[PDB]
Amino acid sequence: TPSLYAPQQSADPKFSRPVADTTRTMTVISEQVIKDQGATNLTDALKNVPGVGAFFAGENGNSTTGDAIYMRGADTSNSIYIDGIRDIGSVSRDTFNTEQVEVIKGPSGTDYGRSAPTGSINMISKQPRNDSGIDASASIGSAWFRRGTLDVNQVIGDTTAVRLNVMGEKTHDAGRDKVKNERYGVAPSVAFGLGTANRLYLNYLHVTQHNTPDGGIPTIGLPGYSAPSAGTAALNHSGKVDTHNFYGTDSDYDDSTTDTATMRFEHDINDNTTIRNTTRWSRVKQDYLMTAIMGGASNITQPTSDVNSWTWSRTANTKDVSNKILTNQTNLTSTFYTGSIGHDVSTGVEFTRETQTNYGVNPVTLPAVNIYHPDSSIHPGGLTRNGANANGQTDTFAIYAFDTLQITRDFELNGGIRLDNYHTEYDSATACGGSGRGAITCPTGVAKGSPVTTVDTAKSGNLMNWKAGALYHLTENGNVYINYAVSQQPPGGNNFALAQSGSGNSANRTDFKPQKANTSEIGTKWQVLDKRLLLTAALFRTDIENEVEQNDDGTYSQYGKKRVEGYEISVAGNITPAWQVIGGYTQQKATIKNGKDVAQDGSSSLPYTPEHAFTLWSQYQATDDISVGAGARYIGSMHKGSDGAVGTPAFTEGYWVADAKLGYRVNRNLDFQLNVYNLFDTDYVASINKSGYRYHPGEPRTFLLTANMHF
Ligand SMILES: CCCCCCCCO[C@@H]1O[C@H](CO)[C@@H](O)[C@H](O)[C@H]1O
């Protein structure tokens, strides 16, 4: 029987073997784990994979929001898929309608097309079930947290059933003042022909969010903080700022809507061969007003020489954006023999249009903020569109073919080839007559504030990616594998932006090549204790090439090289019928092989990347009524990216977070849960910005009481 903590297979038909027989660093976080841990979003559920989280706060004109996930030494936020379909938006993704999350470390261009040199994160959506029931969850937690979720599956006919997922979350912040997060969701689904060779799945998903965004707090007092100048010397002795202090404005807001319609037709030609066709329309809106703080010598105002009077400048970080994705994906999976060789083929054709428009807004001039006693009770107002927007489009036609050749009962070979034919179009304009950062002068006969185009280009290209693996069953319980993969990210692949050919340092330069990630891997997977526990161990090397670097003369070129090398181990499943365990450890060394240093301390290291990361979670069924759980996360020391800012910590120190759980069940319809997070009320640096002026403090000890009603 399969363990609830270790799902046996990926829901993606692109994966022709179970997790154990898959030649990849794959982790499947189930709905069961999320529910026991009290995880309600992607980031929290991703804590189940070591060295995966939002480790970077942003720059000075921009700050990171939502699931700004860093995995394997780089921002992987653009490589977040829902049902094997790209989902782009600096918004938090809720787990109210996801059955499982699939994480793969080590990219492959064959898997989902263009990607970050990290791997893939895939949120698998809830579909209508054969059985009927209702599931409810009411939650009350620390800092006025409230959560209500409903999961209704109802069978209508012999071959038709409906599914409805409802959600409501209204909360405050336990360790941050004025920060409020409100969201709700509806997810209706209808499936026809269940149990037959013909099936139609129709799904809709709507999420509205109204949040108060946080831009962090001053890094004063942290290890490695120095005063920026002799004039501001006092800052070396004044100490750390109160972690609760909110430096934003009472006008700060973060509003986002998510609308995704999906239509899947599945036809079983035979008990071996099946054809699928998925159509999806999706739109992610997001508009926010945020506050970034600056504390260089030129940003510090000294009214009375007493540090309690001293102020830091405020900089508005705005966003008015829409991400639209229209796609059609055809997939065919067949199992057949070619003599003594068994085949497991997965092939398909995908057509996609991705749109990103950043509606320009008027500059928001914010006043200075007191360092130790900030006043956020100010109203500079919301946003006003100025007509000067950025438009990005990407038309993508991909054709793939994957095969797992079962050579013997003990030997397996597997391959894959994909061709992505793309066309990206980019334009961006700025309102003229401005004063500050990148202000364009108004030409003749052009009235003030008029949009003046700065970029208006396009890029077309082909992307040939491939993969290869071999697996050998040592015992009936354990195997040994090898894998190699090619992944590419073309100019305009990262965020639709492009640059005019022959000039800058941009990877998005239309004359530039894509960034290639070559991944070598040797591993071992083992299914023990009646196949109820999965133990894994891999050695990896991800080489990144065609990175942009400056030549001896001012001019730039793609001679740069990076390497993310390491060791991976993982545990998932049941130890005994009452003992459940999920987790792993990673030793990942991410360095610059060729090129300029990116780390602040001039080391060859890559920033916002822990070298060592550990995550363990266990649950024991103490008695028939009492279940007890515990968790432990270690995130290592990380380098801050290089920057002109003086006296800002060049790095953040490592931290250990511990969690606990205890569940009591009354009858078989009602059960209670109590989750305590950050059990030792440990303080730490969750993330730091590029300049190094601001950091996000570690979430303090927080409680969560849940009522679980099942039918
Ligand atoms: C798994 C063992 C259960 C321990 C229950 C919580 C005990 C930790 O308690 C915390 O310890 C910190 C020092 O470590 C103190 O700074 C905090 O004030 C205190 O709340």
Residue numbers in the entry: 50 to 760
Study text:
The ferric iron uptake (Fiu) transporter is a TBDT responsible for import of molecules containing the catecholate functional group. The structure of Fiu consists of a 22-stranded transmembrane β-barrel characteristic of the TBDT superfamily, with a number of extended extracellular loops that might serve in the initial steps of substrate binding. In addition to its role in iron uptake, Fiu has also been shown to be important for sensitivity to antimicrobials that share the common feature of a catecholate functional group or the analogous dihydroxypyridine moiety.
The disorder of the plug domain loop in crystal state 1 opens a large cavity in the interior of Fiu to the external environment, whereas, in crystal state 2, this cavity is present but occluded in the lumen of the Fiu barrel. In this experiment, the majority of the solutions placed Fe–DHB in the internal chamber of Fiu, with the third most favored solution positioning Fe–DHB in the extracellular cavity of the protein. Although the internal cavity would be inaccessible to Fe–DHB in the closed state, because of the fully ordered plug loop, it would be accessible in state 1, as this loop is disordered.
